[PDB]
Amino acid sequence: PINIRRATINDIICMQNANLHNLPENYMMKYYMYHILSWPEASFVATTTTLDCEDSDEQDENDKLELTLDGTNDGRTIKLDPTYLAPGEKLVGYVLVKMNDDPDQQNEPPNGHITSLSVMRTYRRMGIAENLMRQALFALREVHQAEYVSLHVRQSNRAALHLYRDTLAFEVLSIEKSYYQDGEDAYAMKKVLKLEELQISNFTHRRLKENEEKLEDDLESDLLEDIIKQGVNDI
């Protein structure tokens, strides 16, 4: 599955491996270490999660299961795979975000700068990069008080274009000629960020018909009513 969390350092090496399977412009270890130790409340990761699911039991029980060698015997180690992070957890993508710190002789306010967003191509088209970008923007707006955001995009990559300009709905600022190593033109996009528009609770539904019922989370609700065992609404 997909599990969003904060980009930890104990896996940045593996994160670099994801770069080796994503953007050609790689970076050294110093770059990732600086960007992970300077502003850790911005860069996020998306991994997998494997938990229990009827251990042993009796209904069609079988002690010769896989479970990455964790059921019966077969020792208990980690599988030889650089993409794994834990016995039952592997990273599928991440997003690295930095803040403006270089001097520009113009008194620049604290703004958001999307450094990179790399997700495995085999694990896409199901809400990963969009959620990562939304969480990063929300965290920046809530902690660092980012006035706006500015990033870069390519041209032949239609997926990134549909994700930024169409899905996330970002505004194009300028066009940079020959910015990468291959000499390909890029589009620098900029959008003013706000606080009452980047809430996650306001984006719980993907599409709607015309006038539905958008239910959110108010105060208490799960600890109300009564016991679901012999009540009126008990199945």
Place this chain on the structure above:
Amino acid sequence: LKKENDQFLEALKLYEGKQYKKSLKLLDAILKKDGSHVDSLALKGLDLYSVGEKDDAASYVANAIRKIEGASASPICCHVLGIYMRNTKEYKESIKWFTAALNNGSTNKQIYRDLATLQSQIGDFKNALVSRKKYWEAFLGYRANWTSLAVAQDVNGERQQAINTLSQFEKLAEGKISDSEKYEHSECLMYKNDIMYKAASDNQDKLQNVLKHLNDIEPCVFDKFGLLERKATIYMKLGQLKDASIVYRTLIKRNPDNFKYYKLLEVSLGIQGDNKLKKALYGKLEQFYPRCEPPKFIPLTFLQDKEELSKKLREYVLPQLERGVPATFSNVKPLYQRRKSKVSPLLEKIVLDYLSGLDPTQDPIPFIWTNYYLSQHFLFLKDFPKAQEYIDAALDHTPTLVEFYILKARILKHLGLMDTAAGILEEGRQLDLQDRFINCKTVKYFLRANNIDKAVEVASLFTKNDDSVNGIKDLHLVEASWFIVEQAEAYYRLYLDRKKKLDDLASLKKEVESDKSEQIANDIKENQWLVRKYKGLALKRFNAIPKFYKQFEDDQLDFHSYCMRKGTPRAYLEMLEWGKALYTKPMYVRAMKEASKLYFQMHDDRLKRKSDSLDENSDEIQNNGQNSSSQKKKAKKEAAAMNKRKETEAKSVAAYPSDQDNDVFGEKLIETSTPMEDFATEFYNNYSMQVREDERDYILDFEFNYRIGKLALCFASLNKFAKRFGTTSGLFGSMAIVLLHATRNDTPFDPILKKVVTKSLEKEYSENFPLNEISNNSFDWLNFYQEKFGKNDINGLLFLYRYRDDVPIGSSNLKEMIISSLSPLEPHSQNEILQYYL
């Protein structure tokens, strides 16, 4: 001593700025008049090391060190020597020189901060605390000093002292904080909370005070995720369940896509015993987040009814098959690792019933996604013909998907067809040349297909090509690992195939008229030379991943000061944990195991070919001599051609610069003096000093301690393995048999160690293995092993076959048993074991 000191003081400003040639000229002019100047030599060494030279710089530094008797000179020389040692990966000498400089009389307190970094790399915190205290008492106008003091007092043990220091600092600087210094302050607050966590323990009053402080600082702390996490932890450590549930619901509202928050809420609510409560909770939460995945995946783990489970699986797979996601099988990947004969039949039936109502023209996308899911499910169930049929139907329906080619290559690899898989995957990759993941997969599958040249040619495309014909240098500069690991395995396989090739060639031994194998030998000799050169290059490339990790650990120099200047103590602790856990990676363990295997094989075959056979004069002749046919000119031309070919080959496989490493051919690594000593002082001490408890490879430790004369470590590792992973494993019995055969008086070792190991075995395991059958040559250990642990274990049989020369328990019977026991596995593994492991 009068004018030389003045010239040194006037030239020091050149090193202080951005000048090197002007300082080197002055140093040369000074040395031309007096060569016994320690300061000039110490400065020239660092100047030559900072421009590119290494040999001359090291020579000048060694000369300056030799020209020093006592510890009474100028502090500038000691400071330069400390800088040089810090730049040459020397921490102890740098600390010693800085301490000797500070003990003489230096009015620069910043030098102390340098020590506060240097010891921070070696873990020496006893003196680091005093250094931090001195550097804090020296300058009282920077928050970095307070942060460093707090970190030093927290890591050591002065928790109350750190709390009091932080409170005093916040009281003295209450209101004098700028805007940009707010966030950092918040971070510091969080760090103080962490300190309060160390003061939490299980006391009620302490937890209440921590909760009150957190609620008071909440309007000031900018970080909300960690704040709410700590609040929920405090609520769980107390007894308030409603407040903890509210905090977890707020966390879910902030980020619903998180399995950890859902599991923590399930633990807090205390409804893990009843299934209906959790079912109703997840059914109510699904209406709040219809676009998420955990709220639809977690409920598939505690369902008992068959109809309800089938309905939930159908409602979970219908949107994924309708929208079409390239991870549907992934969405059921962990479940298949825990369920099988109970869940997979229902899923297969649902998928078949859904496919029976589709159409190849009306709904082509759901059709191809259903075909892909069926192929994945059958590949997971050890099926191959039906999976190939489905993937062929999918390619005939829509041949414009890379995932289909990837699955076909994976199936062909599992069926032992590596070359065909590589060909299909290259053909599919040629369809769109813009993705790097498919390129890496193609390179890996070509490396697994005994095709290295084509793999390198394919990889040399997206890499930066400047001072090299290919992109090997670029792959080494982007800090790679998997590529080197996959290429070294191919080199090892190609080197091992030559053993069987030479065995098959020598089995004939010129039987009757067999002039074909005698008249044709130059090509075979050239092939053997190339294989040996590539095997040496593989060992050379192996000496990179540990070097890369050492470089990563050493690059943390400026971080010790940056984490204190910027104000990230939590990031500093995370970096410390990362540096401590660097030596706990699976790729590192795999590379270390491969290097150990290579070193042991080199030791074995070197000791075998050292004193064996006879007539060295008739064997050390080699070629380069055709009697009366101009042997000198022929040998000269052959050597010239060999050098001309080797130069081009080294330029093609160029990875390391010429001025940084001269051992390009790798002839010095394969013929070292003490391989075990080097492996222990370079690859074993770090893993021995930085390792946990449950995560420890005992097989590698046993193999390393076997051929050194220390059996107590072997016995301790065996006992720990038997206590942790039980005693019902074939590896335990194999190691016990190996140890019992090693403790025999026939093997030349230490009788005292053998006797104490025998006593320990008789005291511990007295009713497990017969310890009185070492004198009977008719007792078969293979029969006893297959009666107790059985022959179904593969690792034990592989270990026994690897260690069969010292343990005489047969050979042909063991090979036949291994062949008979390998049948209930995968064909590719069986083929690999029969080709290389057997």
